[PDB]
Design a protein around this nucleic acid. Structure first.
Ligand SMILES: [Zn+2]
Length: 44
RNA sequence: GCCGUGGUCUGGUGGCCGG
RNA sequence: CCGGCCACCAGACCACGGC
């Protein structure tokens, strides 16, 4: 089953089931949110 | 010079789907 | 066994900031 998904934190779109889950628990996403969150939080 | 994120590329493993 | 897909790990390259 292929459920469309989107990684707002990385601007990446998903098509495959494992394609999404694998990325959500990945390195290039967890640390990505860190820099993104910092930018948004510091942008005030 | 190193450190942290990001992106592509290079190699190893696994899963999703079909034949 | 083969093909479309993602992650994890390390290397090369570059942008930013810290020391
Ligand atoms: Zn992500």
């Amino acid at each position: 089953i292929d459920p469309d998904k989107f990684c707002s934190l990385c601007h990446a779109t998903f098509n495959d089931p494992v394609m999404a889950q694998q990325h959500y628990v990945g390195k290039k996403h967890r640390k990505q949110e860190t820099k993104l969150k910092l930018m948004a939080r510091y942008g005030r």
